[PDB]
Every structure is written in structure tokens, then in C-alpha cells.
Amino acid sequence: EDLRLHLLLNTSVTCNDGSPAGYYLKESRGSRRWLLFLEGGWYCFNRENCDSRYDTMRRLMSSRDWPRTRTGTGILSSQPEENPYWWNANMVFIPYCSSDVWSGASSKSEKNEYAFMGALIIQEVVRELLGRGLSGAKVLLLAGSSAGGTGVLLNVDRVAEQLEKLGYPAIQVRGLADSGWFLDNKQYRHTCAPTEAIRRGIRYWNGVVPERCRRQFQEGEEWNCFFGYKVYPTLRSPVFVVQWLFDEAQLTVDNVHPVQEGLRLYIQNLGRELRHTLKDVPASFAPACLSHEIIIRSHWTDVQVKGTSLPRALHCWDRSLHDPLKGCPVHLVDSCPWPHCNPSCPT
Numbered sequence: 001e002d003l004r005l006h007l008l009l010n011t012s013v014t015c016n017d018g019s020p021a022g023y024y025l026k027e028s029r030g031s032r033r034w035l036l037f038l039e040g041g042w043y044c045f046n047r048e049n050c051d052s053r054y055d056t057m058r059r060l061m062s063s064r065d066w067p068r069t070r071t072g073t074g075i076l077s078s079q080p081e082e083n084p085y086w087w088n089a090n091m092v093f094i095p096y097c098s099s100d101v102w103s104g105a106s107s108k109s110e111k112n113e114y115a116f117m118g119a120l121i122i123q124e125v126v127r128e129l130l131g132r133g134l135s136g137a138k139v140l141l142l143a144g145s146s147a148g149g150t151g152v153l154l155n156v157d158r159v160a161e162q163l164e165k166l167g168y169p170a171i172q173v174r175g176l177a178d179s180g181w182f183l184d185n186k187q188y189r190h191t192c193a194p195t196e197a198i199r200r201g202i203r204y205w206n207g208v209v210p211e212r213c214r215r216q217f218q219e220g221e222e223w224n225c226f227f228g229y230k231v232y233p234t235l236r237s238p239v240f241v242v243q244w245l246f247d248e249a250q251l252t253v254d255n256v257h258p259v260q261e262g263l264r265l266y267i268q269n270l271g272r273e274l275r276h277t278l279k280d281v282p283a284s285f286a287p288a289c290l291s292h293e294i295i296i297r298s299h300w301t302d303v304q305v306k307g308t309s310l311p312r313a314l315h316c317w318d319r320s321l322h323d324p325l326k327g328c329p330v331h332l333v334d335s336c337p338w339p340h341c342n343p344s345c346p347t
């Protein structure tokens with residue numbers, strides 16, 4: 001059940017402090033399915049708050065203290081009872097140590113105290129995994145939670161193009177974005193809010209975004225591509241979107257903590273706004289819960305939207321991509337308007 005750590009052989013691809021990045025691997029011979037999960041954990045957009053993050057969240061900025069193994073949980077689990085969806089797949093857990101929402105491509109030098117290479121970590125991991133079985137893969141599912149979910153949206157197309165120009169058009173690259181579908185909305189009450197943090201982060205990380213999204217918003221406005229409802233329509237790879245309607249990180253950046261009318265309308269409008277952004281997303285799972293992340297939580301099989309679980313919804317999504325399905329829905333968005341109106345929400 002354990003995934004074994006492999007630091008990157010290309011030591012030029014580093015975490016924030018210059019230590020090498022890496023990945024955790026549990027191989028599954030006899031399986032051409034490969035799951036590459038992107039860890040979340042917020043971000044940092046200037047020297048000062050990155051220094052604070054280095055004091056108290058150093059494992060998200062450095063590999064010096066990483067454990068040698070890690071137990072696969074939820075969709076990374078290998079037992080069918082915990083992971084009905086992809087229990088037999090090759091499991092990859094990519095630690096989040098770049099603090100850049102998996103967007104940076106900047107090395108640390110005399111002018112940069114930290115390296116932000118999240119976009120290069122994903123590519124270098126994919127490159128070093130071909131020699132360990134990925135070259136024979138049939139499906140590469142790029143998954144991620146929180147900032148890792150947004151990292152899927154930023155990197156799923158880049159993963160497909162890298163394998164294309166490397167002589168592997170048979171590997172079908174897909175994305176699974178969990179809790180990374182954020183809104184650049186107005187805060188309930190008025191450090192940089194959210195939309196200004198990404199604006200400064202891109203310049204601080206020299207972050208990169210999907211090409212077609214970059215061409216729409218152009219120079220100075222690439223921060224728009226960090227938000228799912230604006231970057232998703234420009235992606236070519238199939239992406240399944242998992243999003244709590246009332247995400248805790250979304251409420252945090254909205255300064256939402258007996259609910260009076262003003263806050264009630266704000267919460268119900270947020271749930272409404274998120275539903276609207278998913279109306280055109282065919283493969284989606286959006287329960288009306290106040291929570292954060294799901295796909296690597298051990299009890300991720302418990303939540304249901306309209307009677308269908310997330311593992312089943314992901315199974316139906318696989319079927320839909322096998323070249324319209326009866327009793328196998330892929331678009332599952334709660335309609336009720338308040339946190340925990342879905343009885344299967346976590347407690």
C-alpha cells in the first residue's frame with residue numbers, strides 16, 4: 001500500500017530551497033493506467049510570506065525532511081474496497097514543494113531567494129517515469145487537490161504536448177481537478193485577497209499558463225488562467241472537475257468564517273455562482289458541502305450527488321471516453337443551496 005520516494009535524477013529541478021524535487025511511486029505491473037496526483041497546500045507570492053512559510057511549512061518548500069515512503073489513500077489506494085475506481089493503477093504522488101500552484105519555471109539564483117519550478121517538476125517527473133513503465137501506459141490521469149487541482153488545469157495540456165513531441169501519442173492524457181475550481185469573486189468583507197495574490201505570484205514565480213488561455217488574456221493578465229471557469233474552456237484534454245460548492249479555501253479568501261441575512265445571501269450566491277460555472281462542464285462532481293479536498297481522503301467513496309458516488313462518476317467518465325450512458329451519469333452538480341443540504345456531506 002506504500003509508495004516509495006524517488007528524488008529527481010535531474011537535480012536542476014528543485015523545491016523552493018534548492019533541494020531536489022521528486023515523487024512517490026507504487027508500480028502495478030499488468031496495468032497501463034497511471035495516476036499522477038498533484039498535492040495542494042496554498043502558495044506564497046513574496047519573499048516575506050515565503051520566509052514565513054519556510055519556518056512553519058518547510059515540507060511544502062523542501063525535500064530535506066521527506067519520509068522515504070507514504071501510504072496511498074483514497075484514489076491513490078490500491079485496495080478495491082477503498083478505491084473502486086483505479087485500485088490497480090500505477091500510483092504517483094508528487095509532493096507540492098514549489099509554492100506556485102504548480103505554475104513556476106524559475107530557478108533560484110543570485111537574484112531569486114527561492115526557486116519556483118512547479119511546472120517543470122511535473123514535466124521532469126513525467127519524463128523520468130517513462131523509463132519505469134509510463135512508456136507503455138494507455139491512460140495518464142493527472143489528478144490534484146486544492147492548489148494541486150488548479151495545477152491540473154494549468155498543466156494537463158502541457159503534459160499531453162510533452163508526450164506528443166516525445167513519440168508517445170498512444171498515452172491518453174486526462175485531468176482530474178479536485179477542489180481547485182476557484183472564483184475570483186468579491187469578498188464578504190474587505191495581505192492580498194485572492195485575485196491580487198495570483199497577480200503578484202505570477203510575476204514572483206514567473207508562472208506559466210495553458211497556451212490558448214495565455215493567448216486570450218495576453219500579457220499582464222495571465223492570472224485569469226488560474227481560475228477554472230476561464231481556463232477550462234480553452235483546454236483540449238478531458239478534465240473531470242470535482243468541487244465542493246462551498247469550498248473552505250474559497251470561503252477563507254472570501255473572509256467568510258447564527259448566520260445573518262447578509263452572510264446567508266453571500267453564501268447562497270456563492271453556491272449559485274459555482275453551479276453556473278459548471279453548467280457547461282460535462283464531467284463534474286459538485287456536492288453542496290462545506291469541506292476541502294476529497295479524492296485522497298480515505299472515505300471519499302461516501303459522498304453522493306443524486307445517488308451516484310464519485311468513484312462511480314469517474315467510472316462512467318472512463319466509459320464515456322471509450323470512443324449517452326444509461327444509469328451512469330458524469331454531470332453531477334447539487335442544486336440545493338446551503339452547506340450540508342446533501343445528506344452525504346462529511347461531518
Ligand SMILES: O=C(O)CSc1nccc2ccccc12
Nearest residue numbers: 040041042146147150182249253
Ligand atoms: O491549496 C489550497 O489548499 C488552497 S489554494 C487556493 N485557494 C483559494 C484561491 C485560490 C486561487 C487560485 C489558486 C489557488 C487558490
Ligand SMILES: *[C@@H]1O[C@H](CO)[C@@H](O)[C@H](O)[C@H]1NC(C)=O
Nearest residue numbers: 010011012013120121123124
Ligand atoms: C534538467 O532540467 C532542466 C530544466 O527543466 C533542463 O533544462 C535540463 O535539460 C534537464 N537535464 C536533463 C539531463 O534532462
